[PDB]
Structure formats: C-alpha cells, structure tokens
C-alpha cells in the first residue's frame, strides 16, 4: 500500500519491478508514493 493505487511490486531474479494492474504496464522505475 506504499505505492500509488493500482501498482504492485514484483520480485524477479534481477530485482524488483512494478506492475500497474489496471493497464498491465510493467516498469523498472518506481511509480511514486
């Protein structure tokens, strides 16, 4: 809940990325707070 609405943190072998559930967007950059 430390991310903006709709975002979740995903862990993979190389690190953590971010997934925006409503769109399916994924990105390495933190989406903010």
């Amino acid at each position: 809940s430390d991310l903006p609405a709709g975002w979740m943190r995903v862990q993979d072998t190389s690190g953590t990325y971010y997934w925006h559930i409503p769109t399916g967007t994924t990105q390495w950059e933190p989406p903010g707070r």
């Binding site: 979740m8 995903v10 993979d12 990325y17 997934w19 399916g24 994924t26 990105q27 390495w28």
Partner: peptide, 10 residues
C-alpha cells in the same frame, strides 16, 4: 490458476 504478473521490460 491466475497467470504470473507480466514480465518486466527489457
């Protein structure tokens, strides 16, 4: 079951 989250960018 529901699928894994989408993969990250390359």
């Amino acid at each position: 079951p529901p699928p894994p989250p989408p993969p990250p960018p390359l």
